[PDB]
C-alpha cells in the first residue's frame, strides 16, 4: 500500500508505505580454501599455479 502526496505550496512530494531494511552492522565469517585426458589434467594444474601465484603477488609486502 504505497501512497504519495504533493505539496503545491513548497514544490515537494512524499511517498509513503515503504518498509525499512537498513544495514546497521556487519557479520564477519572466515572462508578457508585448502591448497596443496591426463594432458587435460596438466593444463588445469597449470591454471592452479597461476591462481596461487597471482594470489601470492597481491599479498606482497
Amino acid at each position: 500500500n504505497i501512497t504519495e502526496e504533493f505539496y503545491q505550496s513548497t514544490c515537494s512530494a512524499v511517498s509513503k508505505g515503504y518498509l525499512s531494511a537498513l544495514r546497521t552492522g556487519w557479520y564477519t565469517s572466515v572462508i578457508t580454501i585448502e591448497l596443496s585426458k591426463v594432458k587435460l589434467i596438466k593444463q588445469e594444474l597449470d591454471k592452479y599455479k597461476n591462481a596461487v601465484t597471482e594470489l601470492q603477488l597481491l599479498m606482497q609486502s
Binding site: 500500500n1 504505497i2 501512497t3 504519495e4 502526496e5 504533493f6 505539496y7 503545491q8 505550496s9 513548497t10 514544490c11 515537494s12 512530494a13 512524499v14 511517498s15 509513503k16 508505505g17 515503504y18 518498509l19 525499512s20 531494511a21 537498513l22 544495514r23 546497521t24 552492522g25 556487519w26 557479520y27 564477519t28 565469517s29 572466515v30 572462508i31 578457508t32 580454501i33 585448502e34 591448497l35 585426458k37 591426463v38 587435460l40 589434467i41 588445469e44 591454471k47 592452479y48 597461476n50 591462481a51 596461487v52 597471482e54 594470489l55 601470492q56 597481491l58 599479498m59
Partner: protein, 329 residues
C-alpha cells in the same frame, strides 16, 4: 543535496580487523583415472580461478560478493547461524542478490598450505519500520519580467526511516535500493534526525524544526519523477507536457511548479528531456496551497543561500529590513 553533511567511515574496518587477527594467531602458533575425476577437478578449480580473478582486479577487496566467493548454499548457511530474527533471516533469504551487493570479500592470507579470506555480511538491525521518500524541486516565481526572478528549493530531499525513536535520513536517495515496497539502505550514508523533521512537509514555517532550503535566481526548468507521479518545475519559455502512450499529450503545464500522477500518464516532457514516469500502483493526493515563494519580496530576498533554512532565510531578511527601516528617520 545534503550528502556533504554525512560522516566518514571505514567500510571494511571490521573485516580488516578480523583479517589482522588471523595473522596474529599465525605467529602465535609459529612457536616451538576417471572422467568423473576430470570433471570434478575442473569444477572445483574453476571457482578458484574466478575467486582469484576477482581479487586480482579489485586489489583484494571485492563487492558485491559473487557466487564464486560464496555460493547460494554457503550464504544461506551463514544466514541460518547468525544470531538474528527469523524475519531478519527470511528477509535476507528472499533478497540474496541485495545481501550480496551489501557484502564485501576481503583477501587475507595465503600461507602456502591454506588460503583464507574474510566475508563481511550486512546485518539488518532495523526491519519493517515505516519509510518515506521526500522529493523536492525548485520553486520559483511566475513573473513576466525576464531576470530578477526568485527561487527556493527544499534541500532536505531523500529517504526517511523510523529508527529507534529517531529518523534515519538518507540525503542521497541513490544510496537506497527499492524492491517493491521494501527499502534497502546503509546507515553509514545517513543522518540521525528527531522525528520533528517531518513537520517541514506539513508546515514549512514551523518553529519546532528549521526546514532546509536553498535560494537562487536561476529559474531553470526540470522535472522530478516520483514514486507515483511526476513533479514539473516549468519556468521561462520551456515547453512542459505530460503524455499518454496511446492518446498522446494529455496535459500542458503552465509556468510554476505542478504535479501529475502516473495513473494514465506514461511520460513527462520538460524542454528537450523526456521522462518515463514510474508505473507502480498506489494512490496520489494533490494538496493545494499557495507557493511560499510568493510570500517573499524579490528585492530583499537572499538569492544565494546554498545551505540555509526557512527561519535562517527569514532572519536574514529582517536584518536587511532593519537596515532600511532605521534609515529614513
Amino acid at each position: 543535496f545534503l550528502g556533504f553533511l554525512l560522516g566518514v567511515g571505514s567500510a571494511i574496518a571490521s573485516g580488516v580487523a578480523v583479517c589482522k587477527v588471523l595473522h596474529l594467531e599465525g605467529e602465535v602458533n609459529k612457536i616451538k583415472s576417471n572422467i568423473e575425476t576430470v570433471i570434478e577437478f575442473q569444477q572445483k578449480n574453476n571457482r578458484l580461478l574466478e575467486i582469484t580473478r576477482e581479487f586480482s582486479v579489485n586489489a583484494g577487496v571485492t563487492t558485491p560478493v559473487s557466487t564464486y566467493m560464496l555460493t547460494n548454499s554457503e550464504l544461506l548457511s551463514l544466514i541460518n547461524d547468525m544470531p538474528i530474527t527469523n524475519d531478519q533471516k527470511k528477509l535476507m533469504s528472499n533478497n540474496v542478490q541485495i545481501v550480496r551487493q551489501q557484502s564485501y570479500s576481503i583477501m587475507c592470507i595465503i600461507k602456502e598450505e591454506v588460503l583464507a579470506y574474510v566475508v563481511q555480511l550486512p546485518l539488518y538491525g532495523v526491519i519493517d519500520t515505516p519509510c518515506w521518500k521526500l522529493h523536492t524541486s525548485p520553486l520559483c516565481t511566475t513573473n513576466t519580467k525576464e531576470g530578477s526572478n526568485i527561487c527556493l528549493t527544499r534541500t532536505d530531499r531523500g529517504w526517511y526511516c523510523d529508527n529507534a525513536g529517531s529518523v534515519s535520513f538518507f540525503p542521497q536517495a541513490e544510496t537506497c535500493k527499492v524492491q517493491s515496497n521494501r527499502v534497502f539502505c546503509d546507515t553509514m550514508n545517513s543522518l540521525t534526525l528527531p522525528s520533528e523533521v517531518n513537520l517541514c512537509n506539513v508546515d514549512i514555517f514551523n518553529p519546532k524544526y528549521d526546514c532546509k532550503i536553498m535560494t537562487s535566481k536561476t529559474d531553470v526548468s526540470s522535472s522530478v519523477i516520483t514514486s507515483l507521479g511526476a513533479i514539473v518545475s516549468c519556468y521561462g519559455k520551456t515547453k512542459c507536457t505530460a503524455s499518454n502512450k496511446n492518446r498522446g499529450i494529455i496535459k500542458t503545464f503552465s509556468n510554476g511548479c505542478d504535479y501529475v500522477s502516473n495513473k494514465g500518464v506514461d511520460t513527462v516532457s520538460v524542454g528537450n528531456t523526456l521522462y518515463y514516469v514510474n508505473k507502480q500502483e498506489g494512490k496520489s493526493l494533490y494538496v493545494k496551497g499557495e507557493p511560499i515563494i510568493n510570500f517573499y519580496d524579490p528585492l530583499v530576498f537572499p538569492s544565494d543561500e546554498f545551505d540555509a533554512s526557512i527561519s535562517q532565510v527569514n532572519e536574514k531578511i529582517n536584518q536587511s529590513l532593519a537596515f532600511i527601516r532605521k534609515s529614513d528617520e
